[PDB]
């Protein structure tokens, strides 16, 4: 009934207990894709190794701070006056931040599509 | 309906005389054999063409009434003797 | 979208109305009221 | 009728007329099914027959 906060709210829902991560939704190009941008900037460990009905692709070890909770979010705007603003979601300007936006092109990160002046949807936000 | 009995005599009465009314006609089963084609010429009487035969029809409804129990009770004692 | 609710309302029509910095008007009667509980005095007012 | 298939006899002649026609046409295009047993079955028996006239080997021997 909503694969996003579904699983990011299990990582989130986990590291607060503290541990070595667990299973999740089913896979999703998108799940796996956030469960990438995450690793690729740090935070999480190694996306994992399942394969079933749609249960396929991965589990995913924890590691590190990653505190706290991946951000799930449930709207979608972007660019210029935007992105910067919804960068108020962030846990503080001075670096730290990361807002896993959805960018017309690419499921990208607050900066990772700040990149080639991109924009669009607001998929989430990490640490 | 009533209104047949036009706006004249009150209500509760109409009501009742409607209850028994719609019931004063159009039965509705074969107390002999066939289909719905009996009734109740007046009271007591109540013959049916799909046999052409008259049944002892109840009152304002040729449906025996309390002879439900009798239906049982009566023929029911017929149980004894001979079971 | 949806949803409008209570509190302060548009319909108005009171007794000075003009939310006036006053209201001119002739001095019908000189009714010195009388204090409420706790305190107590002859509260000189005007109708 | 016993309800109001009418409103002026020109109109029974009407619906009877039209109606009839339109229906006749509905059969007149349900013939399409014929079209679609023919222009397909032809190549069913033609794919079988073409599978025969392109690999007719053990047909002269068998048993």
């Amino acid at each position: 009934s909503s694969v996003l906060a579904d699983a990011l709210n299990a990582i989130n829902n986990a590291e607060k207990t503290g541990k070595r991560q667990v299973l999740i939704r089913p896979s999703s190009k998108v799940i796996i894709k956030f469960l990438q941008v995450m690793q690729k900037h740090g935070y999480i460990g190694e996306f994992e190794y399942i394969d079933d009905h749609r249960s396929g692709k991965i589990v995913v070890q924890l590691n590190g701070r990653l505190n706290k909770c991946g951000v799930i979010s449930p709207r979608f705007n972007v660019k210029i006056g935007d992105i910067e603003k919804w960068t108020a979601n962030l846990l503080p300007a001075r670096q730290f931040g990361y807002v896993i936006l959805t960018t017309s092109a690419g499921i990208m990160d607050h900066e990772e599509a700040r990149r080639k002046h991109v924009s669009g949807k607001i998929l989430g936000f990490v640490y | 309906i009533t209104g047949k009995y036009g706006v004249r005599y009150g209500s509760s009465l109409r009501r009742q005389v409607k209850k028994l009314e719609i019931q004063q006609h159009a039965r509705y089963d074969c107390s002999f054999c066939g289909k719905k084609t009996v009734k109740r010429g007046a009271a007591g009487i109540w013959t049916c063409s799909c046999c052409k035969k008259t049944v002892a029809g109840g009152a304002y409804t040729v449906s025996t009434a309390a002879a439900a129990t009798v239906r049982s009770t009566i023929r029911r004692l017929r149980e004894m003797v001979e079971a | 979208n949806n949803y409008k609710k209570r509190l302060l309302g548009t319909a108005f029509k009171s007794s000075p109305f003009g939310g006036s910095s006053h209201a001119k008007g002739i001095v019908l009667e000189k009714l010195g009221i009388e204090s409420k509980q706790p305190n107590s005095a002859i509260r000189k007012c005007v109708r | 009728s016993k309800g109001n298939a009418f409103k002026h006899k020109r109109a029974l002649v009407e619906h009877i007329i039209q109606a009839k026609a339109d229906a006749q046409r509905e059969k007149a295009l349900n013939e399409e099914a014929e079209a679609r047993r023919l222009k397909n079955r032809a190549a069913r028996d033609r794919r079988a027959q073409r599978v025969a006239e392109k690999r007719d080997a053990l047909l002269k021997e068998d048993a």
């Binding site: - | 074969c30 054999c33 289909k35 | - | -």
Partner: protein, 98 residues
């Protein structure tokens, strides 16, 4: 399944007589194997019905109940009440009785 369930297979194979005259023919003619005579169906049209085939050559299992229904039994809905199953089926009309 029950006879009210056997006659439903019957109406998919066999030879449904459908009658009360054609019932008589069914019999006299000579083919009526069983004979499904409803309770409603008047005495004489039942005792003479009887006599007809109890003369010919057939066993007759007096019906269940309602005639108006004894038809819904054999589909129709038209209150039949004296069938003459004439040909075999996937039913136990040879075991309708013992």
């Amino acid at each position: 399944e029950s006879i009210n369930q056997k006659l439903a297979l019957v109406i998919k194979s066999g030879k449904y007589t459908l009658g009360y005259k054609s019932t008589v023919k069914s019999l006299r003619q000579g083919k009526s194997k069983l004979i499904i005579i409803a309770a409603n169906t008047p005495v004489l049209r039942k005792s003479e019905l009887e006599y007809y085939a109890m003369l010919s050559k057939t066993k007759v299992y007096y019906f269940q109940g309602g005639n108006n229904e004894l038809g819904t039994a054999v589909g129709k809905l038209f209150r039949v009440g004296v069938v003459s199953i004439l040909e075999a089926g996937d039913s136990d009309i040879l075991t309708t009785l013992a």
